[PDB]
Design a protein around this ligand. Structure first.
Ligand SMILES: [Cl-]
Ligand code: NA
Ligand code: NA
Ligand code: NA
Length: 147
């Protein structure tokens, strides 16, 4: 039986891998309404890719790992362009990493590297202002695979 509700709209995120809570064969599929329903956090920061300080609204990745019952310690983020970013799951609770859904109050289209973007609060901690965390940021996210 499924433990995650089925999406009513077009799924924009699939979580798979070593998870226990699903709504499809070995996977948890989310439409945008389901992601927004998990609760939206706000992160304001300068970044290597944006002009000036920008504001992201998105869902806590720690909350996504909790609802799918992630059993791993690493997540592979798969982008639309088929390149991956590898992220230690420990980063999610340590730095309040979000799966961004909005940028400056607007949804993100494909040419803005949306609809989903893994974002760290770079300016909140000097530790996050370096390539280690810029490479763990993942734009055009389509999938999260728990290893
Ligand atoms: Cl577009
Ligand atoms: Na699975
Ligand atoms: Na936009
Ligand atoms: Na990346």
């Amino acid at each position: 039986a499924g433990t995650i509700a089925k999406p009513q709209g077009k799924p924009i995120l699939t979580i798979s891998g070593n998870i226990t809570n699903t709504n499809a064969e070995g996977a948890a599929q989310f439409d945008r309404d389901m992601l927004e329903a998990l609760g939206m956090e706000t992160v304001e920061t300068t970044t290597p890719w944006h002009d000036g300080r920008v504001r992201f609204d998105g869902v806590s990745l720690a909350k996504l790992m909790d609802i799918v019952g992630a059993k791993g310690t690493s997540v592979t983020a798969v982008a639309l362009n088929d390149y991956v970013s590898t992220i230690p799951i420990e980063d999610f609770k340590k730095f309040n990493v979000i799966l961004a859904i909005k940028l400056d109050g607007n949804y993100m289209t494909v040419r803005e590297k949306g609809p989903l973007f893994v974002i760290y609060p770079y300016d909140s901690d000097p530790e996050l202002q370096k390539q280690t965390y810029y490479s763990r940021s993942a734009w055009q996210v389509a999938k999260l695979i728990v290893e």
